[PDB]
Paper text:
The MED23 subunit is the largest subunit of the Tail module and is specific to metazoans. The structure is composed of α-helices that engage in HEAT-repeat motifs, forming five solenoid regions which are designated as HR1 to HR5. The overall shape of MED23 is that of an arch with a concave and a convex face.
The structure is comparable to the previously reported crystal structure, with the main differences lying in the first N-terminal HEAT-repeat (residues 1–50), which appears dynamic. MED23 core is composed of HR2 to HR5 regions and adopts a triangular shape in which HR2 to HR5 coil to position the C-terminal HR5 region in close proximity to HR1, which protrudes out of MED23 core. The closed HR4-lid region is not predicted to be a protein-protein interaction site in free MED23, whereas the region of MED23 exposed upon HR4-lid alteration has all the characteristics of a protein-protein interaction site. Overall the core of MED23 and MED23Elk-1 superimpose well for all HR regions (with mean rms deviations on Cα < ~ 0.6), except for the HR2 region, which appears slightly displaced upon binding of Elk-1.
Residue numbers in the entry: 54 to 232, 239 to 317, 327 to 1052, 1061 to 1334
The structure:
Amino acid sequence: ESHEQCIQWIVKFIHGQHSPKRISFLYDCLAMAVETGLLPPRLVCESLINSDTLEWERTQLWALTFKLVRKIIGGVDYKGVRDLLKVILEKILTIPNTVSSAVVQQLLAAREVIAYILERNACLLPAYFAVTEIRKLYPEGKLPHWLLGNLVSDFVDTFRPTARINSICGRCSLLPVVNNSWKLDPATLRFPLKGLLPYDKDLFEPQTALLRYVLEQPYSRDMVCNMLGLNKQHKQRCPVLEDQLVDLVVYAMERSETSQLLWQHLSSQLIFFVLFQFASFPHMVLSLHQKLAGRGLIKGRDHLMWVLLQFISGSIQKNALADFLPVMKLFDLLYPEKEYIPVPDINKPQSTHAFAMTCIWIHLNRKAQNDNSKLQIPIPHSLRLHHEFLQQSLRNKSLQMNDYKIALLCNAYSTNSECFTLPMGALVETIYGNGIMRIPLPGTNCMASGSITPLPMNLLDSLTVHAKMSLIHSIATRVIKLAHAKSSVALAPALVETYSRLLVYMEIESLGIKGFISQLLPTVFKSHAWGILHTLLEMFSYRMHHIQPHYRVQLLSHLHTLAAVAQTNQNQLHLCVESTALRLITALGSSEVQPQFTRFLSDPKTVLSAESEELNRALILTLARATHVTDFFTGSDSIQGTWCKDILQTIMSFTPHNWASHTLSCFPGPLQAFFKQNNVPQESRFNLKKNVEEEYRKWKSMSNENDIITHFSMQGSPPLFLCLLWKMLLETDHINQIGYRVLERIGARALVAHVRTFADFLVYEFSTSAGGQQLNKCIEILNDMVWKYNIVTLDRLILCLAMRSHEGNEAQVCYFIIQLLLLKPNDFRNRVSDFVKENSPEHWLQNDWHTKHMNYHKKYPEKLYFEGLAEQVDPPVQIQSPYLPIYFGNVCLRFLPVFDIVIHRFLELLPVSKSLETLLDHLGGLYKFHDRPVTYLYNTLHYYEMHLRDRAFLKRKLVHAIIGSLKDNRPQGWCLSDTYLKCAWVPDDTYYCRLIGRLVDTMAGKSPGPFPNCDWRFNEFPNPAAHALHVTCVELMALAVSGKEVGNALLNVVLKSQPLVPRENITAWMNAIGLIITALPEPYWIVLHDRIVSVISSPSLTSETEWVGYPFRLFDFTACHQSYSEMSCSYTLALAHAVWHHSSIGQLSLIPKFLTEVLLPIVKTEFQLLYVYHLVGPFLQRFQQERTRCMIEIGVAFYDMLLNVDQCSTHLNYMDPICDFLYHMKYMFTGDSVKEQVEKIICNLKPALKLRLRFITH
């Protein structure tokens, strides 16, 4: 209380005293009082500086006050000195630029006190606090105050080495592959930097190149939203995003001047941002008009008008007319001259593009007619032909489908109701088949509409977004009406194909794919149709390419509840649900399992199944593969604490099972530990044999009609009726009518358990049976039971065989059964040979698919209701169950996921490697119809690198069989390089240079292109970059060269003086190398540690040289003419930063162990210590967000290294940068966590270092 008042009174009396001598005397008395301890120095300093009467005008009074504070400022804690520095700088800032020359000499007192505070020898406060306040109150780009002078600039200049330590080399030139490192500030397009340090000038500018690259790539909508922080909560109205899209449009027109895919991508992309209120259409148009004005070069005018028409047609009703007026100004600038524009040729798709402006005028005029008067939009004088041609075409009653006139009418008259029913009717009646006769469908007693010709893809691309929404709404309404009507007539194949082709457009996501799962499927489910549901599920399985993971998981849950309830005890529906679920589980990505399963820990049973053990095992296999590829468990040896525990426990509580040793040995460690416990006892082979024999004897002794049916179909009895069947066919080779009746009453959902037990019974019987004639007889019986009698399907039988838990010889005979069943009979081989010969996988370019489908099904009919057994029973029984519509699938397409699983099991078991070669040779052509062959090859080689390490012939055979089976359907050079086709041998440096260069040119973007262009809407990869990365990885994996050699060669591409890799572009090569080596398995990217150790032991860092200044040249690769040693030292650091930038958190978890056990015992000099700080510095932020524990190890390792270097070295020349880095780390990342172990290390340091870091403990 009275301390502040008394000091203020004394100082104010001093202010009012006109005697400077008395002023000095009273200051001296106050100084003596502070010296003797009468008053707290912090309170005295605060009161003196915060005194209001103290003004710059009284120059002698100001100087004496600042002299007093300078004398007595040294007795304050560091936090106080920081606060007094804050208030002093605030007070100094009030000084104007120009002052009198007679008071300058007396105003230096502020400079004297600020210099004393900033002095490092005094160590009053940590220098990080001082630079933080200076940087906070002086932002980047502000000149220092003239009174302060160059002292502040030099002090800030002291911290650049720390800024370079905490910076990633070549960050602005690193680009990702679109599928927290790439986050940007929404307001300024700037990287989020930690702390207030003088970073490089390149980090203070927007990342326009990065944002443009992400925007240009297809399917980058979600990534852009994540990068810019758009939460989809309200109208963000992001100005930088709007400007980038406008510049992208300008650049597209620039390319158009002296491109169709880019224009389609723009029209497809910038619709979403405008529709979600992220950008404004009128503001976009005005900005585009202003930018394009005065430049000319007008050749992409038709494409730009096509882009604008999408909004003009799709949002005219829900927006005011005032927002679309500037389009007229855009026309005035973009279309010169007054001559009548000629009518283009209507036979080309570009005719729709050339009529875009006319359609815009029609929409605008119609919107003007609504709410008439006020304003009227007249016709331009140069659109008379375009208007008359449209009206004359409208007046025509008959319209043909050989031209694009109907597309022109739909695009122009999509708003007026009266002039739109006729073109819509003419467009939908060609696929609805309302008047034509009826066609047969595969199966028995199934008919559909006569339409077989769907709408062509190029015609669909010629329509507009609004027309496509109207078409898809009409199709959906007709489907719902048919579902409610309960009619036995199936939908037209043309309607189904057109719907599937329309569901690949992302602009209709509001009701295209969202309404397909949210509304249409539940409506058909409640309507109890079972015919449309089968059609939609088959459409999902065989005609869908790109679907978001959450939609896929949602349909997985819908499939599981559909199979669980609603009494879906039909063979066709049950098989369709099982096949769709198996494909959906298998096709899951590696980086999508955790984010899509983390939201279902509330009710895991929604996604997990209740009775399908095969589906549960498939989910477990996918989970193990994803966790292995993503390196999730690297660092943690316990499964508890992760999301997998709840899912695995729920699986074990639903379908308990065991795992084979060879299959379990490839699982990650936590999964192996989980399955070591939770082991379920299994049935004995003697017990199973005795039970089957006793039941079979009971079957002989029983003669009553009802007793057999009521006994062998009981629920809860052991599922061993298939074993009864098998035993009757090897004892008597005939089945009675009672057996057919039992099979009919068991049910599809109950026969699965019988198949499961039959597989184990089947394996045990071959194992204990004489080979030769008995083996040939017993495989002939199985062939008859599969094809001749139609008891079980081949795909389900092989899947159940491959999902068993046998060991050793039992596993060998189990896989030998699959071998014999697949190859020894001629049935499957003939079916696959025919299908591959006369079919093609490109379904989006075909028009006779139904005819080819009918031809195959007529040649090879499919039975799903025990038709063969029904006919072969001695009294011929007749079955008249209607067949659900079948449009796309067959046995060959259904077997594909089972064949992938079979390959994996054959790879797991060692003594059966020769069988896989024979399997691939005979049935390798079936991969022509695979959906993700390259991704499957990448996953298979990545997962089984250890097992395929010593077997290169099998690896090459697998790669060639999968890849070369599609060589007649894609352009040359799509996957493998020319050198590989001529050599496959030790690859040389040129091979790796060209391999990396292919990805570099693909990412850069070139007109010829290393890889051929493809329609990514119907491809497994969204962008060329992902395709290039995966094919490069697959080729490198298939190389018969050790992983260490491959990694060394890839590093040597940059780190050795080599042609074909020019300077001024080395960062792009480093980025490509980092991406490739990160995607490669562990033995490939482990050579980085060895290379770092080699540079650490280099004489460049080991030498006790007398360099003046900070050694900047060793850590920056963009330097002047460099010697070999310095060039290698800087290039290794840059390459390490590039690799670690693209690495996952599991891959980064090995750095603390590497520092602790490798670098620590060999770091003994200041240069090695600085090199380690440069290497591991910039990546502490990543550990802060995911793995907190690794921070503690890194911090103690750094202090241990500092202790070792201090003890070994006589003196240190760069104490200040080390001090600043440790202070920065403590105040930003680690904090107070490390205290006890820090004190022990600090106490043993030299007195100079102890004085420098006396504030770490506090």
